[PDB]
Write an enzyme that holds these catalytic residues in place. Structure first.
Site, PDB file in Angstrom:
ATOM      1  N   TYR A 123       5.319  11.712  55.766  1.00 37.76           N
ATOM      2  CA  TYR A 123       5.993  10.452  56.067  1.00 37.76           C
ATOM      3  C   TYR A 123       6.106  10.201  57.567  1.00 37.76           C
ATOM      4  CZ  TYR A 123       7.042  10.085  50.988  1.00 37.76           C
ATOM      5  OH  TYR A 123       6.948  10.001  49.601  1.00 37.76           O
TER       6      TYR A 123
ATOM      7  N   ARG B  57      20.420   6.205  57.265  1.00 37.36           N
ATOM      8  CA  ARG B  57      21.243   5.225  56.572  1.00 37.36           C
ATOM      9  C   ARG B  57      20.591   4.941  55.233  1.00 37.36           C
ATOM     10  NH1 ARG B  57      18.423   3.953  59.073  1.00 37.36           N
ATOM     11  NH2 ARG B  57      17.981   4.174  61.306  1.00 37.36           N
TER      12      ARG B  57
ATOM     13  N   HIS C  48      13.319  15.996  56.590  1.00 37.96           N
ATOM     14  CA  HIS C  48      13.169  14.568  56.502  1.00 37.96           C
ATOM     15  C   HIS C  48      12.202  14.160  57.585  1.00 37.96           C
ATOM     16  CE1 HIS C  48      14.383  10.447  55.368  1.00 37.96           C
ATOM     17  NE2 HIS C  48      14.072  10.181  56.619  1.00 37.96           N
ATOM     18  N   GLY C  49      11.044  13.646  57.165  1.00 35.12           N
ATOM     19  CA  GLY C  49      10.060  13.110  58.095  1.00 35.12           C
ATOM     20  C   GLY C  49      10.125  11.593  58.176  1.00 35.12           C
ATOM     21  N   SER C  50       9.733  11.033  59.313  1.00 36.36           N
ATOM     22  CA  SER C  50       9.754   9.589  59.479  1.00 36.36           C
ATOM     23  C   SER C  50       8.844   9.207  60.626  1.00 36.36           C
ATOM     24  CB  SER C  50      11.169   9.098  59.767  1.00 36.36           C
ATOM     25  OG  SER C  50      11.207   7.686  59.810  1.00 36.36           O
TER      26      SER C  50
ATOM     27  N   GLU D 171      12.573  17.292  45.377  1.00 31.89           N
ATOM     28  CA  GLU D 171      13.020  16.079  46.042  1.00 31.89           C
ATOM     29  C   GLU D 171      14.538  16.122  45.891  1.00 31.89           C
ATOM     30  OE1 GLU D 171      11.599  11.540  45.155  1.00 31.89           O
ATOM     31  OE2 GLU D 171      10.173  13.200  45.433  1.00 31.89           O
TER      32      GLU D 171
ATOM     33  N   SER E  56       7.535  16.228  53.619  1.00 38.44           N
ATOM     34  CA  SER E  56       8.155  15.415  54.664  1.00 38.44           C
ATOM     35  C   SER E  56       7.219  14.995  55.790  1.00 38.44           C
ATOM     36  CB  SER E  56       9.412  16.080  55.228  1.00 38.44           C
ATOM     37  OG  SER E  56      10.481  16.014  54.295  1.00 38.44           O
TER      38      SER E  56
ATOM     39  N   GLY F 206      16.531   4.547  66.180  1.00 42.01           N
ATOM     40  CA  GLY F 206      17.421   4.109  65.120  1.00 42.01           C
ATOM     41  C   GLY F 206      18.109   5.283  64.446  1.00 42.01           C
TER      42      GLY F 206
HETATM   43  O1  LIG Z   1      10.974  13.228  54.517  1.00 38.11           O
HETATM   44  C1  LIG Z   1      11.251  12.088  53.723  1.00 38.11           C
HETATM   45  N1  LIG Z   1      10.818  10.839  54.349  1.00 38.11           N
HETATM   46  C2  LIG Z   1      11.189   9.639  53.603  1.00 38.11           C
HETATM   47  C3  LIG Z   1      10.710   9.664  52.093  1.00 38.11           C
HETATM   48  C4  LIG Z   1      10.819  11.110  51.520  1.00 38.11           C
HETATM   49  C5  LIG Z   1      10.426  11.323  50.167  1.00 38.11           C
HETATM   50  C6  LIG Z   1      10.771  12.584  49.517  1.00 38.11           C
HETATM   51  C7  LIG Z   1      11.047  13.671  50.378  1.00 38.11           C
HETATM   52  C8  LIG Z   1      11.332  13.397  51.782  1.00 38.11           C
HETATM   53  C9  LIG Z   1      10.696  12.205  52.352  1.00 38.11           C
HETATM   54  C10 LIG Z   1      10.425  10.191  49.163  1.00 38.11           C
HETATM   55  C11 LIG Z   1      10.397   8.830  49.780  1.00 38.11           C
HETATM   56  N2  LIG Z   1      11.155   8.682  51.048  1.00 38.11           N
HETATM   57  C12 LIG Z   1      12.156   7.675  51.086  1.00 38.11           C
HETATM   58  O2  LIG Z   1      12.282   7.035  50.068  1.00 38.11           O
HETATM   59  C13 LIG Z   1      13.108   7.225  52.188  1.00 38.11           C
HETATM   60  C14 LIG Z   1      14.357   8.008  52.288  1.00 38.11           C
HETATM   61  C15 LIG Z   1      15.293   7.420  53.287  1.00 38.11           C
HETATM   62  N3  LIG Z   1      15.209   5.952  53.524  1.00 38.11           N
HETATM   63  C16 LIG Z   1      16.260   5.277  54.089  1.00 38.11           C
HETATM   64  O3  LIG Z   1      17.192   5.926  54.352  1.00 38.11           O
HETATM   65  C17 LIG Z   1      16.257   3.845  54.377  1.00 38.11           C
HETATM   66  C18 LIG Z   1      16.508   3.433  55.676  1.00 38.11           C
HETATM   67  C19 LIG Z   1      16.517   2.089  56.047  1.00 38.11           C
HETATM   68  C20 LIG Z   1      16.789   1.738  57.439  1.00 38.11           C
HETATM   69  C21 LIG Z   1      18.053   0.964  57.561  1.00 38.11           C
HETATM   70  N4  LIG Z   1      18.876   0.928  56.533  1.00 38.11           N
HETATM   71  N5  LIG Z   1      20.029   0.250  56.539  1.00 38.11           N
HETATM   72  C22 LIG Z   1      20.405  -0.452  57.636  1.00 38.11           C
HETATM   73  O4  LIG Z   1      21.598  -1.151  57.633  1.00 38.11           O
HETATM   74  C23 LIG Z   1      19.583  -0.497  58.845  1.00 38.11           C
HETATM   75  C24 LIG Z   1      19.973  -1.242  60.025  1.00 38.11           C
HETATM   76  C25 LIG Z   1      19.150  -1.244  61.148  1.00 38.11           C
HETATM   77  C26 LIG Z   1      17.922  -0.519  61.132  1.00 38.11           C
HETATM   78  C27 LIG Z   1      17.537   0.203  59.986  1.00 38.11           C
HETATM   79  C28 LIG Z   1      18.383   0.222  58.820  1.00 38.11           C
HETATM   80  C29 LIG Z   1      16.250   1.123  55.105  1.00 38.11           C
HETATM   81  C30 LIG Z   1      15.986   1.512  53.814  1.00 38.11           C
HETATM   82  C31 LIG Z   1      15.994   2.863  53.437  1.00 38.11           C
HETATM   83  F1  LIG Z   1      15.735   3.144  52.203  1.00 38.11           F
HETATM   84  C32 LIG Z   1      13.965   5.287  53.157  1.00 38.11           C
HETATM   85  C33 LIG Z   1      13.449   5.804  51.890  1.00 38.11           C
END
Ligand SMILES: O=C1NC[C@H]2c3c(cccc31)CCN2C(=O)C1CCN(C(=O)c2cc(Cc3n[nH]c(=O)c4ccccc34)ccc2F)CC1
Length: 345
Positions: A241, A212, A196-198, A322, A238, A205
């Protein structure tokens, strides 16, 4: 001073870097002049999310109203041009994603500005504790680290070659409370060590709170498989991202053990409101998969470090696999890598 090893201190400085926060924001054309990091409010953003979800379904005056309301909560700065109206599934998606990162930036910054000035403790140590995460360095020399650097090597996808990957630091991580929250799902089968990259600005966070899932309101665009936690088995899918640039060629990436169980295998996008009974995750089927023959079992957990070969998958929207889970407890964060992005150009 702090007794934490140097590579761990740099990580904590790297995750709480106020400048990277401003710089990502600036990249979002957000106008810091009108709203600097301090003006960033949890409510300012949560309320901003609501507006977006109205535009989402209000889909012809009134839209100007919604946008003007949005762009007022989150003042941008195209300098001129006058900001793009939120009037299509694309324009709303990109804005929720930006908002999603602004949440973590608010988390990072607020964690930073909290705490007592009681300064027996080194600053770095004080901020380390705010992460609620145990962090140790994995020996470059050890075998544990040889596998990890091998997983990175053989799983770069042929088509991503806009950069190369080098492993600077391998960290072993244990978020507080996470072992206990993961434990039921330990009984699930088919457990896997996945990327998981970010963006680096997301890591205060992610460590304090965990991966989350998207809240009650947000577009389902850009989600081939709905609101969940997404993982890949190809390092480069990953790494993309991490949003590392040539001017910022160093990223943070995660290796997480995920309890996939019985996967709901899909070749095409379907948002799907509920997993079918007996299914515990979704696997999108790409054309290029890690070679099963190299797959390695580590403490009851698979490591698909097989180099990318083909699967008999046709025809599919996915280039590479995925994996998505819809319950945050199905993930146990194990490693965090500091990666080096050597760009081709
Ligand atoms: O390595 C991956 N990176 C992300 C990415 C992904 C891909 C496929 C393979 C791996 C990669 C496809 C697209 N990706 C994603 O769609 C993400 C996955 C995880 N994600 C979340 O977990 C996510 C996090 C948050 C942050 C957050 N959520 N909820 C909260 O209550 C909160 C509260 C305070 C601060 C942040 C948050 C918001 C929306 C989200 F969708 C974002 C979407």
């Amino acid at each position: 001073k702090s007794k934490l090893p140097k590579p761990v201190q740099d990580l904590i400085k790297m995750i709480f870097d106020v400048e990277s926060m401003k710089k990502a924001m600036v990249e979002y054309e957000i106008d810091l002049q009108k709203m600097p990091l301090g003006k960033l409010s949890k409510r300012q953003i949560q309320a901003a999310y609501s507006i977006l979800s109205e535009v989402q379904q209000a889909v012809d005056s009134q839209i100007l109203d919604l946008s003007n309301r949005f762009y007022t909560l989150i003042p941008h700065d195209f300098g001129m041009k006058k900001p793009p109206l939120l009037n299509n599934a694309d324009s709303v998606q990109a804005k929720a994603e930006m908002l999603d990162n602004l949440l973590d930036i608010e988390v990072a910054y607020s964690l930073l500005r909290g705490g007592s000035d009681d300064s027996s403790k080194d600053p770095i140590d004080v901020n380390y504790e705010k992460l609620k995460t145990d962090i140790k360095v994995v020996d470059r020399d050890s075998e544990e680290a040889e596998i990890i650097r091998k997983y990175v090597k053989n799983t770069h996808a042929t088509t991503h070659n806009a950069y190369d990957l080098e492993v600077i630091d391998i960290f072993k991580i244990e978020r507080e409370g996470e072992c206990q929250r993961y434990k039921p799902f330990k009984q699930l089968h088919n457990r896997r060590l996945l990327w998981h990259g970010s963006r680096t600005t997301n890591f205060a966070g992610i460590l304090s709170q965990g991966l989350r899932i998207a809240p009650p309101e947000a577009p389902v665009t850009g989600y081939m498989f709905g609101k969940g936690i997404y993982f890949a088995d190809m390092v480069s899918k990953s790494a993309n991202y991490c949003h590392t640039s040539q001017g910022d060629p160093i990223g943070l990436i995660l290796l997480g053990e995920v309890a996939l169980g019985n996967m709901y295998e899909l070749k095409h996008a379907s948002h799907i409101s509920k997993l079918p009974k007996g299914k515990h995750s979704v696997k999108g089927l790409g054309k290029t998969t890690p070679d099963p023959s190299a797959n390695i079992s580590l403490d009851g957990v698979d490591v698909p470090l097989g180099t990318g070969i083909s699967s008999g998958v046709n025809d599919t929207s996915l280039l590479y696999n995925e994996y998505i889970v819809y319950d945050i407890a199905q993930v146990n964060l194990k490693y965090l890598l500091k990666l080096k992005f050597n760009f081709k150009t």
